[PDB]
Paper text:
G3BP1/2 are paralogous proteins that share a domain architecture consisting of an N-terminal NTF2-like (NTF2L) domain that underlies protein homodimerization, two intrinsically disordered regions in the center of the protein (IDR1 and IDR2), and a C-terminal RNA-binding domain composed of a folded RNA recognition motif in tandem with an arginine-glycine-rich IDR3. The NTF2L domain harbors the binding site for several types of proteins, including host proteins that regulate SG assembly (e.g., caprin 157 and USP1058) and viral proteins (e.g., non-structural protein 3 [nsP3] of alphaviruses). Most of these interactions occur in a mutually exclusive manner via a common binding pocket in G3BP1/2 NTF2L.
For instance, caprin 1 and USP10 show mutually exclusive binding to NTF2L, with antagonistic effects on SG formation. To determine whether these interactors compete with the N protein for binding to NTF2L, we synthesized three peptides derived from the G3BP1-interacting motifs of caprin 1 (aas 361–381), USP10 (aas 1–25), and nsP3 (aas 449–473) from SFV. Thus, we used crystallography to examine whether a shared interaction mode might exist at the three-dimensional level. In caprin 1, USP10, and SFV-nsP3, we observed that aas around the key phenylalanine residue were in close proximity to a side of the NTF2L pocket made up of G3BP1 F33 and surrounding aas.
Numbering used by the authors:
A (entry chain A): 1 to 138
B (entry chain H), D (entry chain E): 6 to 23
C (entry chain D): 2 to 43, 53 to 139
The structure:
């Protein structure tokens, strides 16, 4: 009954659909993916012309998501690649289009790291979430 | 939905992810 | 809490070394990787010998990089995950916007020393067609 | 480089990284 480690690509494509399903349906609940040492960034520019910084931990991630204005978010996933990494982790690379409150779709580049939770089988958490729009950066 | 990805009770899962 | 290195400083140091070498000697790129490293430049190849060949088949000539942003964070088991957003021009063809994802794992012995456990590259133009 | 990456001798290091 001893198993193989789960397929990285399948793990990655099912997480990415859950992630973007929740962002549209109840983004007050995105915080549930994240742990104590989880990094999060979702685009943004500062006072200078310069990309905005990461926040750390559940409660900081939650208020950060809340302060963004996720209303009837629409997503198109153009690219998903996933590979085993350290400690039976999965690294996921995503490129797509995102629109908030039915404004224009903007192109994006994202990287996730999923860590085993270790409790049940097939149970993961998001250790890292790096999301950047292409316009704010290029 | 074969994989679980955060802290969610059973219904929360079958509201959002089924 | 062991005075872990700064992930950003580790990130920016690896990124200068990588693109410096990609330009100056792409032959030597394989020296970043271990036996269980995965590599994609748009199916994955694993380990130094297979990665070296993949490198060579992509003729890296007078290869010019423009990095626009770099994000590095600490990940599982003392790793650093790095997303790069840049432009690449190979043999003075038109600069093409790319995304690259790196995972950097500790060698376990030597201090301040890392190898590349994951390398994923993708041109954005191939994806938004 | 206070930080080493991959498998290089100090001689190769000087030629490329400094």
């Amino acid at each position: 009954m001893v198993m193989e480690k789960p397929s990285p690509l399948l793990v990655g494509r099912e997480f990415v659909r859950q992630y973007y399903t929740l962002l549209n349906q109840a983004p007050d609940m995105l915080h549930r993916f994240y742990g104590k040492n989880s990094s999060y960034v979702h685009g943004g520019l500062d006072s200078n012309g310069k990309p905005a910084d990461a926040v750390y931990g559940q409660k900081e991630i939650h208020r950060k998501v809340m302060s963004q204005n996720f209303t009837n978010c629409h997503t198109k996933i153009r690219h998903v690649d996933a590979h085993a990494t350290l400690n039976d982790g999965v690294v996921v690379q995503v490129m797509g289009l995102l629109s908030n409150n039915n404004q224009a779709l903007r192109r994006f580049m994202q990287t996730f790291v999923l860590a085993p939770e270790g409790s049940v089988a097939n149970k993961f958490y998001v250790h890292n979430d790096i999301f950047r729009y292409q316009d704010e950066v290029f | 939905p074969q994989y679980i990805f955060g802290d969610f009770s059973p219904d929360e899962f079958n509201q959002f992810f089924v």
